[PDB]
Amino acid sequence: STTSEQSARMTAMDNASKNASEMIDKLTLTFNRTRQAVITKELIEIISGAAAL
Amino acid sequence: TTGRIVAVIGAVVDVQFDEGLPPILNALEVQGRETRLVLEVAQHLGESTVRTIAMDGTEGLVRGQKVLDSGAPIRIPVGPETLGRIMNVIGEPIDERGPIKTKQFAAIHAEAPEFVEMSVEQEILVTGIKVVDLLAPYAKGGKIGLFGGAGVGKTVLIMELINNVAKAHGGYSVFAGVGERTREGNDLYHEMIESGVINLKDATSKVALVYGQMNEPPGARARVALTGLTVAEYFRDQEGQDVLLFIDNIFRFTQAGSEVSALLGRIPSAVGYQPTLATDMGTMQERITTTKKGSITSVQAIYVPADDLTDPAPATTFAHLDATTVLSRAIAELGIYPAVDPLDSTSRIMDPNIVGSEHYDVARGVQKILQDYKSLQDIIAILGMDELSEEDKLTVSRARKIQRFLSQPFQVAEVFTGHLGKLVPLKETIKGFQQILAGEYDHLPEQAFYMVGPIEEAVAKADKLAE
Amino acid sequence: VDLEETGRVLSIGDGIARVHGLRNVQAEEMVEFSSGLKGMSLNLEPDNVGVVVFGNDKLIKEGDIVKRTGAIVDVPVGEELLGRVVDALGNAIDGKGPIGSKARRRVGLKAPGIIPRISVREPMQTGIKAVDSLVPIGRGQRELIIGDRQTGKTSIAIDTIINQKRFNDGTDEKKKLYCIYVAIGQKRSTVAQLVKRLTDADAMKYTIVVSATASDAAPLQYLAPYSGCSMGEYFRDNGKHALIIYDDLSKQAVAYRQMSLLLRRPPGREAYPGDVFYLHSRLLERAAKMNDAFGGGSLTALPVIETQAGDVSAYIPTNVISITDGQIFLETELFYKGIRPAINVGLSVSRVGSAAQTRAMKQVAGTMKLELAQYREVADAATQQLLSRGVRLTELLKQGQYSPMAIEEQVAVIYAGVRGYLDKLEPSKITKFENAFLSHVISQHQALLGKIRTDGKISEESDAKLKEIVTNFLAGF
Amino acid sequence: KTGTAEVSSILEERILGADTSVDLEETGRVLSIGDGIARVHGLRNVQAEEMVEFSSGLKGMSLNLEPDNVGVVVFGNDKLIKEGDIVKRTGAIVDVPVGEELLGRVVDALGNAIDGKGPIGSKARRRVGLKAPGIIPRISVREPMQTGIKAVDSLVPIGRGQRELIIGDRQTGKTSIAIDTIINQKRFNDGTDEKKKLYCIYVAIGQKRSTVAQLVKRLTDADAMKYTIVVSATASDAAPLQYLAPYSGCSMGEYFRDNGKHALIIYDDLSKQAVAYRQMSLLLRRPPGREAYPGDVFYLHSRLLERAAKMNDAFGGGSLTALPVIETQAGDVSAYIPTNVISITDGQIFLETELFYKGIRPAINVGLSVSRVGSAAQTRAMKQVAGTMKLELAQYREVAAFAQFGSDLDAATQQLLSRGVRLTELLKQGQYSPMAIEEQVAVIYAGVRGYLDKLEPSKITKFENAFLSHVISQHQALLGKIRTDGKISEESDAKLKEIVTNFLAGFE
Ligand SMILES: Nc1ncnc2c1ncn2[C@@H]1O[C@H](COP(=O)(O)OP(=O)(O)OP(=O)(O)O)[C@@H](O)[C@H]1O
Ligand SMILES: Nc1ncnc2c1ncn2[C@@H]1O[C@H](COP(=O)(O)OP(=O)(O)OP(=O)(O)O)[C@@H](O)[C@H]1O
Ligand SMILES: Nc1ncnc2c1ncn2[C@@H]1O[C@H](COP(=O)(O)OP(=O)(O)O)[C@@H](O)[C@H]1O
Ligand SMILES: [Mg+2]
Ligand SMILES: [Mg+2]
């Protein structure tokens, strides 16, 4: 039982790390999109304020 | 023609020409200047006024100074006498070795070759480097992106490419350093002098350097890539040969363009880049092609902001790249050189229709075996080396031999490796990797493949170290 | 100086000249500058005229003389353009002589209304098994090709163009398709190589190529799609069939964003103006399918979009997905893995072309689609069977490059695959079987394929003979 | 359209021919004044960045020369300036005094003493806007700039003529790195070796006056003012003074560089010079860019930092190291100014708060820190020990995740964890207690040869202490040999082995 339990824990941790890696990839893509969008939004606000004087 | 400076806002100078206006992109020289100041026109505001971006510091200018219209855009000295000479964007030498004497001058604002001055067939540029020529061949007249850029061998690789291209095909080379640190610029000058690609004595140089410094105004760092392109276009057209053009860095090219666009008073676009980003990049990258006379193969060092591959700068440059090289810190640790990541490197012409079926199959087999070894390394780290089959230990051995054989000794690094540089032709590389994959050399030791030229050198090394 | 039919450039810079004069210039009219360029008069203002220059602003100077041509922006159209490359204004750039065309069409002409059109009833054959069986494209449809950097979209377009030769070499005037390839913001090297590839496949004699490469000013890239669409509308309205391929429609969006920002317009989401949706719908609403009271012609459209890191819910991809009649999602993961064309049949749909698909292909591809759908949901007994069959089909739909297939060969191959004849063949050898099998049927048994093509269905006798052929061949492989 | 000089007063003057009695060449009349920006009419013969002087005794820098008017930025409160005032040319671009007469003096951005110790000597003047050297005067960085900090000197070496960058968050130790670097140079300045003396300049942009006063007290306590200049541009100073102070410091250091000596300038903090320039540019109605910063802000920092050079012997051989300090926010080194200055400089000392509170003060985060000069800026002995230390630390950083587990892992990772923990406890340092290079090399040599693999980590910080005193008292000949010689000779290696074993053989 202990042999099989340790093997199963190794397999489960491998799968959990793989799933966390996929989720990290997706969230990194989302974070890059959001960061660029925030930069553009703030810059457009500044531009509109400057041109609206 | 003579005009007057009417305004001076930062690096932007508004001039007024009572007689006749100079067309856009011309260069105007400010008269009454201790050091040559050149202003590039960029707008026609009306009322005979033009707005110009300055190529040098505008401090000390007075509303009214006379400005002389040259009549043509920035014209630089191009020829065989620029080889081994540093010169800034406006063509003035900055290495203090006297004037660049030439009988030719070229305007830096030219147009891409027309649709009929274009080679219709792809080609391959043989650089004499195993990894580059096998897993990521460099298309002739195609842009190559180069990643890494930190103590991994970028400069030694650049110098080796220069030497091989000037030794194999005999073409020269240009090194346009956009936004170049002066410390690293001087270091590079001296590394070239030591390795031999520049010769201050006998005039047998192989590189023309063009430095747009990092403390020049934004209007100068944005145009040095064009000065380098002009110096290379001379060799392409007039000399009718294949040239190399190293642009380091290209992100700095886009960034300087962005700064100029902001200074002129233009609304930024996506991530605060110039609204003309795509065209500003295209007008340059479209002059690096394979005309019917010669060709220019460019090598852009590339920096990815925030490690974001979708940032407008690399998202726009990657549209132009025709290949890719990825120097990796993780491979210089292993003592493999050049530290080119065999798997992350990419090429567009790695296609059986272009590079040939045998080359394509050898490259695909090498990539597959390297991926297999990469996968097996996890098993080795966890379950231990014993767990392998016998049709997997064999693949591990073959992949280690292939990794060793992909390393090479450079002619410009004989003071780092103690060996003698090798310029491996293409057929030699393909045959060597075909033989290693077939298993013809499974009886040799792995270290017999480390840092050797063709495969026969591996055989000789095995004999010399075993006997 | 005639200040009615002529004006003087008040201020050049940004690619938007301000002219003073031209008091009788119509909105959206084309004017000609002294140097040689041409422009379009956007903003008719009280005191000046904002002319967007179709070229490089370097050539224009303050003081130059602008002369109105007298006609709205239009391009030369006709049969005379087939086999020629042309810039965005219809001026040849392949150096084979003057274009010489008799008819000129407006690039801003409006799309046909609701009554001229009619449902899509004819198939547009692409010779790509994955596209032809799973996401069929009819004639008059607008089927977006959306993908990433290097995933094989221009390959889909060029395989379609090269495949149309079976029909453009025959005599049936009702099947001939005239192709148009609009290249926007794209390396000129690529355009030249593509034109050579077409000339080598004898596919230029019925193909127009409109170029607006990356070295061409923004207005030319913004105007190339409309020039191409007018060149195609000529055939559509003259009772013939055309197929226009805009490539890409995201480079046009970037060019239009540059044009708008340089005009100081309010940037929106991702700095794109508010007109981008209008910019693209105005263009893709012209790919209609006229009814027989208007000629019966058609104009298919295959816009190409390059997502960024696989983001399909971006702004421009979503606009063009809200404009078009389907999708062909090319997945980069599949492409790098080894599947090519890397079509992600899960997310790729064709709303309209499903009813235009050919009966012979219809019946076989129906069961192919069901089998692939079942396989998609399980990736013991039935599970193992589904995995095996799905892998067989997936390896069956892999295809070479620049080697399109006639519909009959696709029918034969997919029939062999879906009826379980390869259920014992090892999954790797399927391609080796496929490329071999075709040769057999492409040599000895031309009568069967010809009968299938003519009858337009897999009749029971055709079914039996095809069964015999496939089983006998599989016996000796 | 409209102009700012079309006000009815100017037109009134010009209509009735009253514009000929006014000298609109060397004098001007203020059209507008607000938020520290004056718009002046006249001054037709005024140069860009020239200094004008208002009637009320104030100064200003004329930045925006437009067709109608001149945009002057005032060097002080615009309380005293009123519309209609009279502004006179000074004739000369802004310059500052330079020389050894400034050492030990606190000055403001314009070279005026503010410590009340009397006038400033000042024999020579120098323009703050002078082009840096070129490709040719320089030569490769070779000499080391002894920071006196074990981490910085071992794993992030700083040469002379190099532009490092102390980038970090708020309250992590950046000013402490700078002050320890300044204080460690006393052992060289006191001595007689004339090519090791380093003169220090501390530019304090945007800090409150109490902070600078405490800092000056700290330097005086350590007797490290007699070779230090401090250039204060505190928060109450007008934006132009905060903008200029880095350039005044850089010119006061360029003097030493040109005259064969060696200088170290610590632009602390550059992210506040960027803010001051941003304010000036926005109030001059210049087109903003990302984050509202003007377009030419990369230019602003590059033309400043590219004056840190290592001149060659044909020019004097002097040098000017730069240690710009930038305060990142959360941890965003991808922001605008952090990005610019990371792309301008030659390295970066990257500080953390996680490390600061985990007990690893100074919080230098190795792995993210880098020095593109590297071993070229190290002594032979420091090279010898630091190569192994860096290799071992790199091995330790990729298995540090297991630290909590540790046990139930192979012996190799056990050894890696143990050695890494000992080495990190070695790199810990006090505050304002720099170390000579011989002391650092002795300590790291003891650490990286396994002679601490028996001591418990909690005791290492004590060992390091006591051991050091031992060698600093009993064994001065060996330390002097290592110092002057510069390397560890085989005899010296044996002596270090014996010393470390003898001291460790009885510690407890
Ligand atoms: N069916 C296929 N089989 C094998 N390889 C293919 C196939 N289709 C495309 N490729 C490969 O993919 C590469 C890029 O193809 P393609 O140009 O069609 O993609 P793209 O999206 O048009 O590229 P870009 O986005 O750079 O214009 C080609 O070099 C080709 O070798
Ligand atoms: N190595 C060290 N050992 C002990 N204390 C330290 C060390 N380094 C810094 N400190 C303490 O941490 C506190 C903050 O340090 P310091 O002010 O130098 O960082 P800082 O980033 O300059 O702060 P700020 O940037 O906000 O001015 C100080 O009170 C200092 O005494
Ligand atoms: N072929 C090679 N043989 C030996 N050493 C090499 C080779 N290529 C790179 N290196 C090593 O890489 C280091 C960095 O070199 P270089 O690329 O010139 O600097 P940078 O990467 O900063 O441009 C050098 O110290 C050199 O020893
Ligand atoms: Mg394409
Ligand atoms: Mg501080």
CA-CA gap between termini of chain B: 80 Å
In terms of DSSP E residues, the strand content of chain B is 15-25%
Query: If helices are DSSP runs of H or I spanning 4 or more residues, what is the number of helices of chain C?
Result: 15
Largest sheet of chain C: 6 strands, antiparallel, barrel
Portion of residues within helices of chain C? 25-40%
SSE succession of chain B: EEEEEEEEHEHEHEHHEHHEHEHEHHHHHH
Number of strands of chain B: 15
Radius of gyration of chain C: 25 Å
Give the number of helices of chain B.
15
Which ligands, by name, code or SMILES, are bound?
Answer: adenosine-5'-triphosphate, adenosine-5'-diphosphate, magnesium ion
PDB class: hydrolase
Keywords: ATP synthase, mitochondria, mammalian, complex, hydrolase
Entry title: bovine ATP synthase F1-peripheral stalk domain, state 1
Chain A: ATP synthase subunit gamma, mitochondrial
Describe the structure.
Chain B: InterPro entries: AAA+_ATPase, ATP-synt_VA_C, ATP_synth_F1_bsu, ATPase_a/bsu_AS, ATPase_alpha/beta_chains, ATPase_F1/V1/A1_a/bsu_N, ATPase_F1/V1/A1_a/bsu_N_sf, ATPase_F1/V1/A1_a/bsu_nucl-bd. Chain B: The modification N6-succinyllysine is found at residues 66, 103, 201, 206, 464. Chain B: Glycans are attached at residue 48. The structure is cut from a larger assembly and holds one copy of chain A (53 residues), one copy of chain B (467 residues) and two copies of chain C. With 53 residues, chain A is an all-alpha fold. Chain A has one domain. Chain A has one helix at 2-51. Chain A is rod-shaped and about 75 Å long. Helices cover 35% and strands 18% of the residues of chain B. Chain B has 15 helices and 15 strands. Chain B has helices at 130-135, 154-167, 182-195, 218-221, 224-237, 250-264, 277-285, 312-317, 329-332, 352-355, 357-383, 390-406, 414-417, 426-438, 455-466, and strands at residues 2-9, 12-16, 26-30, 38-46, 49-54, 66-73, 75-77, 105-107, 144-147, 173-180, 208-213, 242-247, 295-301, 323-326, 346-347. Chain B folds into three domains: 1-73, no CATH class; 74-349, no CATH class; 350-467, no CATH class. The termini of chain B are far apart. Chain B is α/β, with parallel strands linked by helices. The longest helix of chain B is centred in the C-terminal third of the chain and has 27 residues, at 357-383. In chain B, strands 11-10-12-13-9-14-15 form a seven-stranded mixed beta sheet, with helices on both faces. Chain B has a six-stranded antiparallel β-barrel with strand order 1-2-5-4-3-6. Chain C is built from 15 helices and 15 strands. In chain C, the strands form four sheets. Chain C has a six-stranded antiparallel beta barrel with strand order 1-2-5-4-3-6. Chain C has a five-stranded parallel beta sheet with strand order 8-12-11-13-14, sandwiched between helices. A two-stranded antiparallel ribbon of chain C has the order 7-9. Chain C is of the alpha/beta class. Chain C has three domains: 2-71, no CATH class; 72-357, no CATH class; 358-477, no CATH class. Chain C has helices spanning 129-134, 153-163, 165-168, 188-200, 218-237, 249-262, 276-284, 315-323, 332-337, 359-376, 381-396, 407-418, 430-443, 446-455, 460-475; strands spanning 6-11, 16-21, 29-33, 38-44, 49-53, 65-72, 74-77, 85-86, 103-106, 145-147, 177-184, 207-212, 241-247, 298-301, 304-306. Chains in contact: A-B, A-C, A-D, B-C, B-D. At the B-D interface, strand 1, helix 3 and helix 6 of B face strand 4, helix 8 and helix 9 of D. Strand 1 (2-9) of chain B pairs antiparallel with strand 4 of chain D, so a sheet runs across the interface. Residues 174-175 of chain D line the site of one magnesium ion.
